[PDB]
């Protein structure tokens, strides 16, 4: 029943070492979900991360210690009720926030159950979850990047040619006075 010192120390050390190397830690209220739901969510995560992401229920007193042993701050608010943790150790972390977001939606669960967490070392609130979940893909962002970098040149060319468009437009705004 009781654990040995050497057992209670490494359990904590393992969790702490993991948290020192995560690009994502998202705190969720998973109470009420079934073992089958846990299986399903884990299956979706594995589909994109292999063993690079995990989702599991962890005793609050354990989460509190591991988070402190690592060097997190302002996390105490995420541990007010029985909490499960979603974390990514390998791979880009945004896809996993997207996956648990959709999953909770697919189960008609209250999205506020998805409290914030930490994304690449930065704290994020429950209100920011959707924003992370709605981010476009890396490929899409790369495409968007091209236009944003070119904006100064596009803006110059549009501004100058606009001078000519002004004339074209005013003439139509008079012609169609029919």
């Amino acid at each position: 029943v009781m654990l040995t010192r050497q057992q209670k120390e490494l359990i904590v050390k393992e969790m702490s070492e993991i948290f020192k190397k995560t690009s994502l830690i998202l705190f969720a209220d998973f109470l009420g979900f079934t073992v089958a739901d846990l299986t399903e969510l884990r299956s979706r995560l594995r589909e994109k991360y292999g063993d690079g992401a995990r989702f599991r229920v962890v005793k609050n007193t354990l989460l509190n210690l591991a988070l402190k042993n690592a060097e997190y701050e302002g996390y105490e608010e995420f541990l007010k009720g029985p909490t499960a943790v979603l974390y990514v150790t390998e791979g880009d972390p945004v896809e996993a926030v997207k996956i648990i977001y959709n999953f909770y939606k697919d189960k008609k669960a209250d999205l506020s159950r998805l409290k914030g967490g930490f994304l690449e070392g930065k704290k994020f609130t429950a209100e920011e979850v959707e924003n992370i979940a709605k981010l476009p893909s890396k490929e899409e962002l790369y495409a968007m990047l091209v236009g944003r970098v070119k904006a100064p040149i596009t803006g110059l060319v549009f501004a100058l040619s606009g001078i000519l468009r002004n004339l074209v437009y005013v003439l139509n705004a008079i012609k169609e006075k029919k």
């Binding site: 100064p152 110059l156 501004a159 001078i163």
Partner: peptide, 29 residues
């Protein structure tokens, strides 16, 4: 003052300066 001298001057501007040029152009036209 010619088309080509204008383009050549714009080529030499920094990106910050070009954004400022475009902002001014938008103000005037």
């Amino acid at each position: 003052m010619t088309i080509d001298e204008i383009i050549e001057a714009i080529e030499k501007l920094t990106v910050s300066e070009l954004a400022e040029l475009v902002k001014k152009l938008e103000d005037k036209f």
